[PDB]
Design a protein around this ligand. Structure first.
Ligand SMILES: CCCc1cc(=O)n2nc(NCc3ccc(Br)cc3)nc2[nH]1
Ligand SMILES: CCCc1cc(=O)n2nc(NCc3ccc(Br)cc3)nc2[nH]1
Ligand SMILES: *Cc1c(COP(=O)(O)O)cnc(C)c1O
Ligand SMILES: *Cc1c(COP(=O)(O)O)cnc(C)c1O
Lengths: 354, 357
């Protein structure tokens, strides 16, 4: 079964917080309301939109002992006409449910949750900024809530959603084979809390070595998997002399991003160059770099969208990536086309109106 | 800048809770808990307070990015009604390593242990004394940053709860599913730390084991199908090796193995006896198979705090059920291990492994 948006209960706030006047630091500023839905042996209770408030959790809650937790991330955008739209939200709903099944957490109806999320954004519509490059970040979470120390499928769970208003400079990456984000047969291809905790120390290491993000390598052939919490793309002339955009395939160690899929879809549509999903090795990159075949390297993801890379520290070898000296033409094109779609300049099936 | 047991604040429950009389593991809790807060002004004062819910910001990094780690150790009440913790220093060592791995705040292991001692003291009447019973102690350290950025927490909570637990068993053996598709941990990963993130993903695997008529998961690693762990327990094999020497083998701490306190204790006990080879070496399924055909395997078992020492009698590997003659061999080793541990844990023999409350 599932909760229904028709059963939504609304509790407007009586202490509305002051909106930001000024820099928006990602994921630190929250809106006045939140979605909340509980599950137990009776199934799903009724969804409610209520004032933003703390969670109350039993000390034995399995969300805190055995990381029975998963999350999502998507953006709503306000056009000049003040119309708010969510970017490809159905894909997040699909991904959220796959995550839930992987952690033996309760299933729900994707279209019911999306509607609840729509209602929640509608209540807080004034929190959605409209300055250029600004958006509203939507964070759905599902956690197990069993008050028991046995490692087991939970009999209670909690689904909730909070919102943040959020506000092109290239980055350097540390590429060290010692660090492993995920493995074939693991859970790196699901957006589960457990995949993130262990990266915090690796990210501090990147900073100490003068880099900004982590380029996650995998396997004997040092495959480029992902960059920070973003998917990685390479625009180059491949060894066979063909110009292509390549990103790693979904073989278990890649989180299937929405921006990622969107970029593949966009480039495939254009039909101007080869667009493939194939592994990428450091060996291939060094060679392509020495032969001037790399045009652009970039990460993709909701929070930072499409972010260029200019440097990769591979062990002690400091490699210049000429992304910015190549425009970066593809990056700009993607950003321009995405911006048109996102802010309702060009109406498109990808957008879901709030 | 650790918290201090000298600075403990105590707050006794207004209305105590009625003890149990059928104790299911990890469901029943005691009257009090320990709680310590950390922030940019460091650690606050530890406190003992009535058992109560946590209040967390909905953005808490503990729930979004699994900034969470735990421990598990037992306290036992002997005939003399004295209560003792089994080798708690090892759990404190392990917890601090977990903390560091997750960039969570460092603390003083002896201060924490004194606070746990004070906490068990306060609830000492909850520690049962029937044969096979103990008190399970569950310390937890979680991140508590109200931010969606994946980052080093500037806030944290350290708490400890207690559960009286009953006799899990005479030893009843289990069946295992050995399917290499399921990978618990990877070299360079965090499988060797007691982090919450390592457990969530195993819930589905365990259901699959139950669907296929097995009771626990035998976690295999690498192209040569190394036996690493069984469920949430370390794995031991008692056999005559390929060189003709009777040995007790357990996989070494190469990164994909959680260094159990019971595991180390079985190694320490077996070495002290001096009666057979005691070694830490990779065990492959190919090795176990050849040893099972040539009749060289005596016993296979799991080691861990919750279930102490658990016999295995069947492994389902490549759709073929392999029989493990553990029970036919006594199981002598297991029974000897269980007896000595019991004597030590319940104070029958004095031993430096036990820490009095
Ligand atoms: C994670 C520490 C607390 C804990 C939870 C839990 O579910 N289990 N289950 C076991 N043992 C089950 C088991 C029995 C025999 C073999 Br062989 C392997 C596993 N121990 C804990 N501990
Ligand atoms: C996990 C979803 C929310 C989230 C958290 C977070 O910390 N980050 N950081 C990034 N991007 C940083 C970055 C910048 C450039 C490159 Br190339 C790679 C990563 N995105 C999120 N999202
Ligand atoms: C969320 C995420 C991405 C990309 O996600 P989008 O769906 O494009 O926002 C990539 N990699 C990791 C590790 C992530 O957590
Ligand atoms: C806790 C744990 C062990 C060892 O447990 P001890 O109680 O310290 O002996 C072994 N394996 C896994 C997966 C664990 O979580």
């Amino acid at each position: 079964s599932s909760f229904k948006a028709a059963d939504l209960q609304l509790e407007m706030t009586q202490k509305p917080h002051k909106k930001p006047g000024e820099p928006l630091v990602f994921g630190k500023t929250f809106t006045d309301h939140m979605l909340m839905v509980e599950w137990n042996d009776k199934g799903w209770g009724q969804p409610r939109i209520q004032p933003f408030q703390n969670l109350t959790l039993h000390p034995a809650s399995s969300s805190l002992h055995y990381s029975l937790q998963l999350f999502e991330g998507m953006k709503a955008f306000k056009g000049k006409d003040q119309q708010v739209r969510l970017f490809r939200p159905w894909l997040n709903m699909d991904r959220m449910l796959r995550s839930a099944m992987r952690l033996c957490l309760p299933s729900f109806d994707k279209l019911e949750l999306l509607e609840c999320i729509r209602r929640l954004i509608e209540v807080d519509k004034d929190w959605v900024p409209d300055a250029a490059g600004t958006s509203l970040y939507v964070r759905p979470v599902l956690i197990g809530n069993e008050p028991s120390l046995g490692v087991s499928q939970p009999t209670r769970a909690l689904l909730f959603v909070i919102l943040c208003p959020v506000g092109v400079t290239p980055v350097s990456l540390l590429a060290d084979p010692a660090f492993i984000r995920a493995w074939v047969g693991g859970v790196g291809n699901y957006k589960l809390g457990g995949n993130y905790g262990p990266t915090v120390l690796v990210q501090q290491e990147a900073l100490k070595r003068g880099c900004e993000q982590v380029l996650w390598l995998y396997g004997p052939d040092h495959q480029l998997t992902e960059v920070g919490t973003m998917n990685i793309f390479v625009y180059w002339t491949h060894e066979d002399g063909v110009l292509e955009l390549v990103t790693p395939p979904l073989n278990g160690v890649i989180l299937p991003g929405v921006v990622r899929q969107s970029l593949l879809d966009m480039a495939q549509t254009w039909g101007e160059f080869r667009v493939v999903e194939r592994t990428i090795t450091m060996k291939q990159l060094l060679r392509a770099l020495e032969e001037g075949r790399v045009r652009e390297v970039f990460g993709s993801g909701t929070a930072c969208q499409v972010c260029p890379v200019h440097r990769i520290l591979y062990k002690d070898r400091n490699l210049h990536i000429p992304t910015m000296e190549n425009g970066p033409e593809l990056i700009l094109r993607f950003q321009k086309e995405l911006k048109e779609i996102q802010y309702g300049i060009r109406a498109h099936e990808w957008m879901f109106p709030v």
